[PDB]
Design a protein around this ligand. Structure first.
Ligand SMILES: COc1cc2cc(OC)c1OCC[C@@H](O)[C@@H](O)CCOC(=O)[C@@H]1CCCCN1C(=O)[C@H]2C1CCCCC1
Length: 126
């Protein structure tokens, strides 16, 4: 499974090196975005328990947020900042970099591990 591939070989991109955010490049792109930059991605995500999914392709469009401004979970602010234009990466994320012990009830259970596929389409400035 894609999660498994991440857990065994994936790159630890956390500062603390605690394996809370792991990354596999699936496609190499072609500069990575700065804090405050406007980011454009396609993503799919899911809970480790296999009980919930979500995809940008549902909106049939890109997901957009401002990098590093805590508008998304910490894993994204860290993860997307490591990506180049064109890149597709998988991220496997422990709760400490997502919704923690409190979770986001009932959407995200307590202590949930998450997985995302992210394609970095572009990124503009403030
Ligand atoms: C916890 O709430 C959601 C989580 C997710 C998707 C949602 O809606 C499509 C959610 O409810 C709407 C709130 C959104 O504005 C945003 O605040 C969520 C922040 O989400 C994130 O930071 C991350 C990264 C960006 C994509 C969304 N993602 C999520 O955690 C999804 C989860 C992913 C696991 C499957 C369930 C939804």
């Amino acid at each position: 499974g894609a999660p498994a591939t991440v857990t065994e070989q994936g790159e630890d991109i956390t500062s603390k090196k605690d394996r809370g955010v792991l990354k596999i490049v699936k496609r190499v792109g072609n500069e990575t975005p700065m804090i405050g930059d406007k980011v454009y991605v396609h993503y799919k995500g899911k809970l480790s328990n296999g009980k919930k999914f979500d995809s940008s392709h549902d909106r049939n469009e890109p997901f957009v947020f401002s990098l590093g401004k805590g508008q998304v979970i910490k894993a994204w602010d860290i993860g997307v900042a490591t990506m180049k234009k064109g890149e597709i990466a998988h991220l496997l994320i422990k709760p400490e970099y997502a919704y923690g012990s409190a979770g986001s009830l009932p959407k995200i259970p307590s202590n949930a591990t998450l997985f995302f596929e992210i394609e970095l389409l572009d990124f503009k400035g403030e």
